[PDB]
C-alpha cells in the first residue's frame, strides 16, 4: 500500500486535537472517515445531475436514474452480488429489521410461527439480536442462540440445530472480538434444517474481500458509513429467488404497480423494498467508496489491517494487567482489539488516550450480552482502517501505559 497517498485522501486526518497532538482515529468500527473521492462524487452529482429517480421524464431524471442504478451495479460488483439483489436502507440495522419483519408476514411462505425456532448468537451486535427478539414476540416463535467460547468465537458445540430451526442469524466478523466466523459451516448446518441464513457483514465488507454468492448466505446486511461511504445508506443483500417470494416491508410510492383506494399490487424486487424517495446522492457516494476500496484491493486492505491488529495485541499484551476480549491469536481474526486494564475503568482509559489525541470507543460496543458473558461492563476498543499506521498503534500502547501510571 502507498499509505502516505491513501491518508492524503482524508482531510480529517490532518486535524490537531484539543490536547495538541495530530488525530489518531482508531474508531473506524463505529464510523469511518471519508476520502475526497467520495465527498467529490456526491457533490458533483448534486450540483449537476440532481433529479427524481425512476419518475419521468426530463433530462435530470434520466441522469439521476443512471447514477442510481450504476451505483447499485458498482456496489453489487464489490460484494459479489447481482445488481437486482441489493436493497438500499438507511443503515444495516434497518436491513436486518426488514428481514425480521418479512419473516413474520403471513404472505411469506417461509414465515415463522409457534413451534418454529429462530437462532442468533451471544456474540452479536444488538442490531442482529433485538429484531429476532421482536419477531419471536410477534409470532410466538422461540429464540435460541449459540454461546461464545473463552477466546470470543461462536461456540459451535453450544447449540444443535434441529428441524424446528427456520432462521439462523450470525455475524461474519465481530465488532468486539474481531473473529471471522465459519460461514460455510453455519450455512451447512442451517441447510440441514432448511433454515434461512442472515449474515451481519457490517465489519467484513470494509475490512476483507466479500463475495456474497460464494458465501451462500440467504441475506446479508452492511452499512455505507463504515466502508468510507456516506451516512444514511445501508444495504440488504437477498438471493434473487428469495426476494421474488417476499412481500413488502415499508409501503408507499415507488414500490407499487397498481393502486386503488381499496388495495395495491407491488413492483418486483428490489424496487418492492424501496418505499419513497431513495438516498440518491448517498448511493453515488457509496459506489465511489466501493470503487476506492476496489482500487486499493481488499486483500491488501485486509493484510494491512491484520499487521496493525497483530502489533496492537503484541503491544497491549506486553502491558501488565491488560487483557484482550477476543483471541490473542491472529487465526481467523481481524479488527478490532477490545481490552480491559486491571484497576483502570474503560472510561478513564479512553480519557487518557483522548488526551493524547487517540480516539477509541469505550463501553459495550452495542454487544452487552457478550460483555456480560465475560463478566465485563465496558471495554476500550481500538479499531483499524486502511488509513491507520504503525505509529498510531504505538501511541495507543503508550496511552494505555500512561493510564496505568496516572491512576495506578
Amino acid at each position: 500500500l502507498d499509505l502516505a497517498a491513501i491518508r492524503a485522501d482524508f482531510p480529517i486526518l490532518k486535524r490537531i486535537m484539543r490536547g495538541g497532538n495530530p488525530l489518531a482515529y482508531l474508531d473506524s468500527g463505529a464510523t469511518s472517515q471519508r476520502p475526497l473521492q467520495v465527498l467529490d462524487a456526491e457533490r458533483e452529482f448534486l450540483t449537476a445531475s440532481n433529479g427524481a429517480v425512476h419518475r419521468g421524464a426530463h433530462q435530470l431524471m434520466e441522469e439521476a436514474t443512471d447514477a442510481y442504478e450504476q451505483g447499485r451495479a458498482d456496489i453489487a460488483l464489490f460484494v459479489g452480488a447481482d445488481t437486482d439483489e441489493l436493497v438500499f436502507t438507511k443503515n444495516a440495522t434497518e436491513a436486518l429489521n426488514l428481514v425480521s419483519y418479512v419473516l413474520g408476514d403471513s404472505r411469506f411462505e417461509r414465515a415463522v410461527g409457534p413451534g418454529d425456532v429462530i437462532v442468533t448468537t451471544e456474540l452479536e451486535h444488538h442490531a442482529n439480536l433485538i429484531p429476532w427478539q421482536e419477531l419471536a414476540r410477534r409470532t410466538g416463535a422461540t429464540l435460541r442462540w449459540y454461546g461464545v467460547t473463552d477466546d470470543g468465537r461462536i461456540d459451535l458445540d453450544s447449540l444443535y440445530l434441529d428441524d424446528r430451526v427456520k432462521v439462523v442469524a450470525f455475524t461474519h466478523h465481530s465488532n468486539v472480538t474481531g473473529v471471522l466466523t465459519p460461514v460455510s459451516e453455519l450455512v451447512s448446518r442451517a441447510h440441514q434444517s432448511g433454515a434461512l441464513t442472515v449474515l451481519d457483514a457490517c465489519q467484513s465488507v470494509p475490512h476483507q474481500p466479500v463475495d456474497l454468492h460464494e458465501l451462500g448466505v440467504d441475506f446479508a446486511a452492511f452499512s455505507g458509513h463504515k466502508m468510507l461511504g456516506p451516512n444514511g445508506i445501508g444495504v440488504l443483500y437477498g438471493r434473487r429467488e428469495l426476494l421474488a417470494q417476499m412481500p413488502p416491508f415499508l409501503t408507499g410510492g415507488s414500490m407499487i404497480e397498481t393502486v386503488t383506494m381499496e388495495g395495491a399490487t407491488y413492483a418486483p424486487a428490489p424496487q418492492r423494498f424501496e418505499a419513497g424517495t431513495p438516498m440518491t446522492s448517498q448511493v453515488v457516494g457509496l459506489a465511489a467508496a466501493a470503487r476506492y476500496l476496489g482500487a486499493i484491493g481488499m486483500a491488501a486492505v485486509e493484510a494491512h489491517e491484520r499487521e496493525l491488529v497483530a502489533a496492537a495485541i503484541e503491544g497491549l499484551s506486553g502491558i501488565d494487567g491488560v487483557r484482550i476480549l477476543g483471541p490473542t491469536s491472529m487465526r481467523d481474526r481481524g479488527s478490532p482489539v477490545a481490552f480491559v486494564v486491571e484497576g483502570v475503568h474503560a472510561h478513564d482509559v479512553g480519557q487518557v488516550l483522548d488526551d493524547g489525541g487517540v480516539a477509541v470507543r469505550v463501553g459495550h460496543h452495542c454487544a452487552l450480552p457478550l460483555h456480560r458473558r465475560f463478566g465485563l461492563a465496558a471495554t476500550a476498543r481500538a479499531s483499524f482502517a486502511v488509513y491507520n499506521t504503525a505509529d498510531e498503534v504505538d501511541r495507543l500502547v503508550a496511552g494505555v501505559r500512561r493510564s496505568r501510571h496516572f491512576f495506578g
Binding site: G56, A57, H58, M61, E62, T65, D66
Partner: protein, 143 residues
C-alpha cells in the same frame, strides 16, 4: 431542430394514422401491459405464421406509433422471425444511440432510433413490442 430527431415523420404518421388498431377476432392470446395496451395475436391454421395483431389502448405518440409499426413488421411473418424482429428492435432502442438498426429487419422500426438517447421514452417505445412478445409466446403455447 432536435425535436424532429426523436419525433420523426414516420412516428407522427403512424400516430395520426395507426394501422391494425381495434381488437379483432379470431385471436389465440390476449395480454394487457402498462401508456397502456391491450393486444391480441392470431396464428395461421398450422401455427407457423402471425396472421393478425390487433390492439387497443391509450398512450403517448411514441407508444401508439411503435405499436402501429410493430403490427406492420410482424403480420405475415413466421413465428421465429417475428421474435427475431422484436429482439432487433429491443437492441436498437436500448442502445443509447450506439446501434442505428437494420432497415432490412425493422423497416419503419428504424425511425425509433432517435428515441434511444432518451432513456425515459424507451419504455414508451417498448410497450407494444414487449406486449406482442408475450401474446406471441402465449398464442404459440395455446396452439
Amino acid at each position: 431542430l432536435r425535436l424532429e430527431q426523436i419525433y420523426q415523420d414516420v412516428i407522427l404518421d403512424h400516430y395520426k394514422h395507426p394501422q391494425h388498431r381495434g381488437l379483432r377476432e379470431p385471436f389465440g392470446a390476449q395480454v394487457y401491459h402498462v401508456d397502456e395496451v391491450t393486444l391480441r395475436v392470431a396464428l395461421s391454421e398450422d401455427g407457423t405464421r402471425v396472421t393478425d395483431v390487433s390492439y387497443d389502448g391509450q398512450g403517448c405518440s411514441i407508444s401508439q406509433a411503435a405499436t402501429s409499426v410493430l403490427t406492420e413488421q410482424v403480420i405475415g411473418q413466421r413465428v421465429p422471425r417475428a421474435l427475431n424482429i422484436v429482439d432487433a428492435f429491443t437492441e436498437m432502442v436500448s442502445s443509447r444511440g450506439t446501434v442505428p438498426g437494420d432497415e432490412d429487419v425493422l423497416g419503419d422500426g428504424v425511425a425509433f432510433a432517435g428515441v434511444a438517447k432518451y432513456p425515459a421514452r424507451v419504455k414508451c417505445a417498448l410497450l407494444g413490442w414487449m406486449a406482442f412478445k408475450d401474446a406471441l409466446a402465449q398464442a404459440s403455447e395455446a396452439f
